[PDB]
Amino acid sequence: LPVYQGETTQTLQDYLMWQVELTPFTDTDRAIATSIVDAVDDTGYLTIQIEDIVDSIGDDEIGLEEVEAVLKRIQRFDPVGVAA
Amino acid sequence: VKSDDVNGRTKMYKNIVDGNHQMEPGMPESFNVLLKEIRSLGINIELED
């Protein structure tokens, strides 16, 4: 009884975050996949686009191409069409 | 491996899929949580070497 949780493997947006954590990726790829996943609304689409994540980060190393690649690697893992 | 804290479950799955078959001693993750305790870290004389 430290914390509480719901459906898993089936773990909701966090299931997408885990499937991202369930694949081989670097620190930046995982960070961008997490930015895509956490920025997903209740409709399942990517709530905040790549531009919003880049602006909030303010990091030149994270680029539009890198963010798009990390999101496309996370386009359809669990389930298909997440962070739409 | 054999219990509950699915936190290193991802690491175990990744290592096994890679065939790495490797684990990290880390801390009883729950004793790391017991440090979270520690009278709220009140007892941390922990001289980690």
Add this chain to the structure above:
Amino acid sequence: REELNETNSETKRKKLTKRIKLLEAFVQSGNKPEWMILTVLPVLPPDLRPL
């Protein structure tokens, strides 16, 4: 130490050298004894208190 050295008996040997050893240890410890009643208190992480 002086009382144990001088006052020696069946009961005088006890209940005091225990106090002496406790004091010696607390000196070896060095912390402020006022920690028995503290000044701060831990609060559970939300991931420490469940529903």
